[PDB]
Amino acid sequence: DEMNLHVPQSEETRAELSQLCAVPLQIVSPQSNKPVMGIVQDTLCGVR
Amino acid sequence: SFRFCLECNNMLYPKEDKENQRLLYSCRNCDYTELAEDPKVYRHELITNIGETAGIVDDIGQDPTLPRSDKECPECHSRDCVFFQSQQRRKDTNMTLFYVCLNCKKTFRDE
């Protein structure tokens, strides 16, 4: 897999990214009012 | 079963002898008009079974793909017969079988 990276070129767009799009702010989704990121693969098996 | 003309070799269509009230058959080409045997003039079917036993030949025993059963032949008590299901191909048809003996070539069934 490959993913794209976009760099904001001003302070207004930096602030928008960090205060609206940041990963911690997206943990709960409005699609099914539940989390979208969970413990996965080896940490799940290992914690069990 | 409609016939054909003894003179013009076309097909005869129904007509009425109004002076005798007897169903003739009129040639649309010639003037010939013969007496008929059957006063039926039309038919229509929805529950049909044509194609039940018709799917058999003399050398159907020579087909090496037909599965062979141990059913007793009603005719000659033969312990070896090839079998197959109804050759009619409709959706609601049975799954009942037909049985062909390899000795007398008489077809039979398990009923």
Partner: protein, 144 residues
């Protein structure tokens, strides 16, 4: 088209999850899954008329214009680099000039190396094409 590696199946350190996979650096150092790469560039001279043609030649700055931003210091006097020379990206490997139609009367049509690739020139071929004009093939080599 492969090699028999020694494979363990383990959740060793967590760097092999979701179809990742941990590989031995020492085995890499000893030649595991090591491969050669060969890239060949091609170029020839065209005939735009009667006496108007291109030429393989090292382009001097005075008589040429629109020279590429790469270095030309690797070409021999025939406009061709010699096998055995290390080449980096943007370096010229085939020098060519296109005459200016009616001093300083030539444009360049030089072939650089691909901007991504390093390597060492392997085999500089020289022949003539279907129409008898000069033809050059340059094969680069590298190791991945």
């Amino acid at each position: 088209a492969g090699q028999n590696a020694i494979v363990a199946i383990a959740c060793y350190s967590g760097y092999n999850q979701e179809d990742s996979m941990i590989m031995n650096q020492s085995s890499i150092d000893r030649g595991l899954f090591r491969s050669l790469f060969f890239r060949s560039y091609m170029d020839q001279e065209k005939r735009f008329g009667i006496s108007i043609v291109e030429e393989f030649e090292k382009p001097t700055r005075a008589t040429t214009l629109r020279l590429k931003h790469g270095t030309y210091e690797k070409l021999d006097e025939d406009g061709l680099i010699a096998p055995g020379v290390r080449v980096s990206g943007d370096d010229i490997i085939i020098g060519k000039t296109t005459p200016i139609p009616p001093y300083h009367t030539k444009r360049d049509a030089s072939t650089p190396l691909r901007s991504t690739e390093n390597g060492i020139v392997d085999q500089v071929l020289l022949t003539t094409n279907q129409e008898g004009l000069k033809f050059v093939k340059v094969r680069m080599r590298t190791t991945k």
